[PDB]
């Protein structure tokens, strides 16, 4: 059938790159134009791209076998031999990391708990700090299935071990650039988002991470190309791709006011025509509708044109 | 268009009553047959039932205007004036609570954080204990927009009143029965799951909560009727209802070998024909296929035939 979209407002959706609600919808021409996000990526033909999972609960998480060692130059670490989050074997393949693995940089606080398999399993929990970044550490290679972290909080002298699940808690020194996935070697990646026509800019769905700085915590924005419900929608459908892009309208739910027309490119990112210097936010209580298949060179009206 | 389901394995899905992956798929005739779950409830016509939200991130969470008051020999007491989790006004209506509010009982550990509205907002995080009730001394009223939690404190914690979001962390004394929604008074509820034909039992999607005691923590099962991906699927579609149920087959994804046939009743729960007395677990790497619309009286094949 013709491609269509759920008639769900962004403010009711789940974020696709940090596991929290969508709070914001914006364009910002001052930001990197062609981010190389690995989560929140789907093709309109139904193919999840990069490390994108179908479940929001997998976003910025990982599963592993946990053990401990002294690391040369660093000190006491935990090593994590990664597993897919459903417990299935991780095999290095056509994506940078296990499904849902973090696709940004910074020092991530993770909470690591014993795997839950049945009622009565005894659970330990330990908190760690994991450096995602331009690391050159042979122990940090999520593509090959191994990462490491430092212990930062422990309930007891009996730390978590064996099969575990890691969830994100907070970020320090956040940078929205891909981590080092394969210890400075080439790694399979979803390509950068783009290209855009002249005057076209990426539509961003925004949430907030808890960013710590020793004493005081602050909100830090993180964007994604589509909410997780739109990711799972395309993955659950097998739409026929009839052209390069879909023309959409975003309308106020209550009044029907057109807020903007936009293009959903086949590779799963939305473009608006906007040439301001700084951020333009939109109401999150609007609806998307599919108008038509259109060519890549289809010229959009500028936001607020009459 | 004919009803179809996403071709997603249970083990790749999100749980609809506790915000975690689905780990298990089972029937268990020892458990309560007709539970009154309020989350994870959707009609095949696309209507969210009970308190069920679209987003898995809303499950067992709430949002509120918080007021904190210190009480000698308790600590900080939070009065939360609930809002919907999108920041919209909560109005007592045709469901027991704001969307996604917990639908089980026990003492819930919640992590409460300052509302996040823009980069640079200063955030404070505090962990509270919330008795979901019913207890002879519980006066929770989420239906009216008013709930309470407390944190043990020798002195004031200098908490700041304002808008917050609360997420679940652990449970103590879990019981799978509805919480105190309205100060011991009646409240609109999604009806119990059912009814079932003779020999039919509920199919359960299982995850595990962290359940704490004084010095220990252990996994505790919680079941839901559908994964959150099926909830959001039905709510996103507007299928034309043609009969009373959908005949499904649960199949090995590779081989296509049938594990069982089942009925998805229009009111959003799946039945199998199973008369064992013990729990019967299923592999979580199968998929559900819609076969056809069938009436309420359609007799399923017994699991194993």
């Amino acid at each position, epitope marked *: 059938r013709m491609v269509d979209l759920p008639v769900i407002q962004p403010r009711l959706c789940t974020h696709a790159r940090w596991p929290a609600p969508v709070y914001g919808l914006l364009v910002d021409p001052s930001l990197p134009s062609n981010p190389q996000w690995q989560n929140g990526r789907v093709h309109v033909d139904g193919t999840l791209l990069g490390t994108t999972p179908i479940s929001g609960s997998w976003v910025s998480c990982f599963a592993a076998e946990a053990a401990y060692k002294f690391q040369s130059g660093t000190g006491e670490v935990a090593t994590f031999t990664l597993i897919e989050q459903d417990g299935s074997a991780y095999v290095p393949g056509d994506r940078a990391a296990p499904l849902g693995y973090p696709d940004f940089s910074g020092q991530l606080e993770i909470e690591v708990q014993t795997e839950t398999t049945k009622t009565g399993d005894k659970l330990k929990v330990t908190t760690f700090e994991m450096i995602l970044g331009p690391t050159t550490n042979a122990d940090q290679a999520p593509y090959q299935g191994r990462v490491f972290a430092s212990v930062t909080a422990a309930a007891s002298l009996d730390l978590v071990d064996g099969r575990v699940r890691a969830v994100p808690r907070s970020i320090y020194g956040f940078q929205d650039t891909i981590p080092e996935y394969n210890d400075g070697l080439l790694v399979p990646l979803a390509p950068p988002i783009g290209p855009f026509l002249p005057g076209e800019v990426l539509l961003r769905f925004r949430t907030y991470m808890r960013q710590i700085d020793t004493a005081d915590a602050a909100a830090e924005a993180i964007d994604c190309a589509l909410p997780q419900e739109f990711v799972s929608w395309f993955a659950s459908n097998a739409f026929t791709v009839q052209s390069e892009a879909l023309l959409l309208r975003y309308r106020n739910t209550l009044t029907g006011q057109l807020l903007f027309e936009c293009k959903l490119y086949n590779e799963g990112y939305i473009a608006l025509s906007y040439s301001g210097s700084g951020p333009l936010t939109f109401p999150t209580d609007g609806i998307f509708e599919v108008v038509s298949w259109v060519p890549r060179l289809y010229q959009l009206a500028s936001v607020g044109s009459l | 268009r004919m009803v179809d389901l996403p*071709v997603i394995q249970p083990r790749l899905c999100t749980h609809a009553r506790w915000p975690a992956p689905v780990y298990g798929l089972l029937v268990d005739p020892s458990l309560p047959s007709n539970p009154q779950w309020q989350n994870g409830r959707v009609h095949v016509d696309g209507t969210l039932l009970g308190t069920t939200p679209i987003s898995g991130s809303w499950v067992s969470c709430f949002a509120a205007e918080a007021a904190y008051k210190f009480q000698s020999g308790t600590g900080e007491v939070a009065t939360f004036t609930l809002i919907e989790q999108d920041g919209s006004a909560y109005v007592p209506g045709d469901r027991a609570a704001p969307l996604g509010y917990p639908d089980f009982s026990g003492q819930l550990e919640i992590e409460v954080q300052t509302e996040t509205t823009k980069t640079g907002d200063k955030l404070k995080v505090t962990t509270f204990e919330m008795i979901l009730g019913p207890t002879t001394n519980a006066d929770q009223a989420p239906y009216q927009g008013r709930v309470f939690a407390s944190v043990t404190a020798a002195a004031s914690l200098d908490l700041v009143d304002g808008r917050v979001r609360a997420v679940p962390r652990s449970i103590y004394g879990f019981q799978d029965t509805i919480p105190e929604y309205n100060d011991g008074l009646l409240v609109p509820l999604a009806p119990p799951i059912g009814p079932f034909l003779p020999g039919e039992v509920l199919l359960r999607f299982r995850t595990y909560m962290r359940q704490i005691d004084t010095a220990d923590a252990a996994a505790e099962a919680i079941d839901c009727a559908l994964p959150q991906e099926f909830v959001s699927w039905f709510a996103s579609n507007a299928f034309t209802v043609q009969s009373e149920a959908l005949l499904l087959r649960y199949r090995n994804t*590779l081989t296509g070998q049938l594990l069982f046939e089942c009925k998805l009743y229009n009111e959003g729960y799946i039945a199998l024909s199973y008369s064992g007395s013990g729990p019967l677990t299923f592999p979580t790497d199968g998929i559900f296929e819609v076969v056809s619309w069938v009436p309420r009286l359609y007799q399923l094949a017994s699991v194993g035939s």
Partner: nanobody
Amino acid sequence: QVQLQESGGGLVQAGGSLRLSCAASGRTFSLTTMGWFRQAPGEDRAFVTSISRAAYTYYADSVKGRFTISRDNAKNMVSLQMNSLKPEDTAVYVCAGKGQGGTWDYWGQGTQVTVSS
């Protein structure tokens, strides 16, 4: 649900070439990406190559510039042209497919490739 049937394979001398193909049948709208893994005795499957519905390809470093994958969407069929075969390419080659959850869900029966010296 989705069956994968391989063709091709067998014995070749080092420096030679073989073509493998794979055809999918059953409920193929649940089959997204198709690819090839290979396995030596006592070892796990290792990724060789994949190709998406949009014909986007990935290759293991060890086979880059020697192996080429192609796909026919209408026939749910892929081909792997393997040139400049090396001893270390000796393995059982297995056609694979992802389902809608982005996991590798479907396996062929496997075909022995032996690169003799």
